[PDB]
Write a protein that binds this ligand. Structure first.
Ligand SMILES: [Cl-]
Ligand SMILES: [Cl-]
Lengths: 159, 159
């Protein structure tokens, strides 16, 4: 029913908590954490999440991206630009529309988000079905992890 | 041509700089600052803006909301919930669609954003033509100033 938001190697607990708040603004609650730099549970994530702490309590903790997507039927990978990696590349609008169609059919949808400073590696994206790219100023990109999560959760809710 | 983003009594320079980065991600560059708490120019805003510093250099500084909107044909006021204040209340999607139609006709459009901790006062909203409300979880609202700015700039660019 809900897509799962999957944070890949997040670096700072505060970013994890901020991502969780962004989701919950739009009534989304399914989070997974992959191979976090600072281990887990993370009291800084809990602090920053505040009222969204329950998202963190129920987030699956996974050692690898492959394990985190094993039960997904379709996986989107978010990237700053439309990388040429053999995958289709959709805007958040066209991606979440496809996502809603899949979930309406009873399929499980995952969305990968990379660490704030580097984004996903090509090898992480290789595991996904499709790339999602926010249409951005070619001269300036400044979306942080929570903002990326916010935009996707926002598009999901828009419908 | 571009809508003007108008920050009303912003409290912390870092929030101003973060708002400017959010705009510039979507190629938007028209900013106004109304009656800021810490005065202006603000080296903390400049620091946080980084590559978006030019938005801050060209932002008009105004003593009141009335002055900041004097040259606008149509003003949207962002609020967390759909306040009953005699104005129409639109989602960001329907608001920015109307906004694009107005600017396409050569009309000047302004968008008001309140201080991060309180939002706009009813007396600020009284000066606007319409309210914009992000559709949000009734149980949880956590959009900060930069996120609010990000969502509107994102919707503007979407079209
Ligand atoms: Cl991170
Ligand atoms: Cl503020």
């Amino acid at each position: 029913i809900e897509p799962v938001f999957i944070l890949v190697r997040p670096q700072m607990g505060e970013n994890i908590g901020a991502a969780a708040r962004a989701m919950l603004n739009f009534g989304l609650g399914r989070l997974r954490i992959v191979d976090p730099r600072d281990g887990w549970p993370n009291p800084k994530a809990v602090a920053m999440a505040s009222g969204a702490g329950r998202l963190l309590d129920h987030a699956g903790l996974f050692p690898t991206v492959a394990e985190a997507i094993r039960d997904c039927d379709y996986v989107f990978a978010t990237t700053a630009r439309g990388r040429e990696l053999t995958k289709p590349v959709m805007t958040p609008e066209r991606a979440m529309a496809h996502g809603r169609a899949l979930t309406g059919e009873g399929r499980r949808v995952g969305i990968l988000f990379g660490p704030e400073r580097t984004g996903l590696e090509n090898e992480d994206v290789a595991l996904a079905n499709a790339i999602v790219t926010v249409p951005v100023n070619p001269e300036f990109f400044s979306l942080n992890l929570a903002q990326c999560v916010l935009l996707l959760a926002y598009e999901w809710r828009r419908q």
